[PDB]
């Protein structure tokens, strides 16, 4: 049963480090999504 | 008879053991999943939104 778990227990921390990157992407775009929202925001406020 | 049901006992507890661990990486994998579906709503929401403004 302990091999069983140790060679079930690897192979995570490879989703683990998949998903760390993956969600800096989903943080990073969707900051620069806001911005350039944000930014159009302004461009509309000035002209009005 | 101790030890025989003993031992199946203990195989017993270490197949349900067993059972439960053998769905961390599939958990791992539908978080990763759920973070990219996440990120696709409010992507498209963020798209939409600053294409409106």
Redesign the interface.
């Known amino acids: 049963?302990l091999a069983?778990?140790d060679k079930?227990?690897k192979?995570?921390q490879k989703?683990?480090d998949?998903?760390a990157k993956?969600?800096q992407?989903?943080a990073n775009?969707?900051t620069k999504?806001?911005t350039?929202?944000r930014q159009?925001?302004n461009s509309?406020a000035d002209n009005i | 008879k101790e030890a025989r049901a003993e031992e199946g006992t203990q195989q017993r507890m270490?197949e349900f053991?067993?059972k439960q661990?053998?769905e961390?990486?599939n958990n791992?994998?539908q978080?990763?999943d759920t973070?990219?579906m996440?990120?696709e709503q409010?992507?498209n929401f963020?798209?939409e939104?600053?294409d409106q403004?």
């Open positions: 049963h069983k778990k079930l227990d192979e995570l989703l683990e998949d998903f993956l969600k992407d989903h775009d969707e999504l806001k350039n929202k159009q925001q509309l | 270490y053991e067993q661990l053998k961390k990486i791992l994998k978080k990763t973070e990219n996440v990120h409010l992507r963020l798209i939104k600053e403004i």
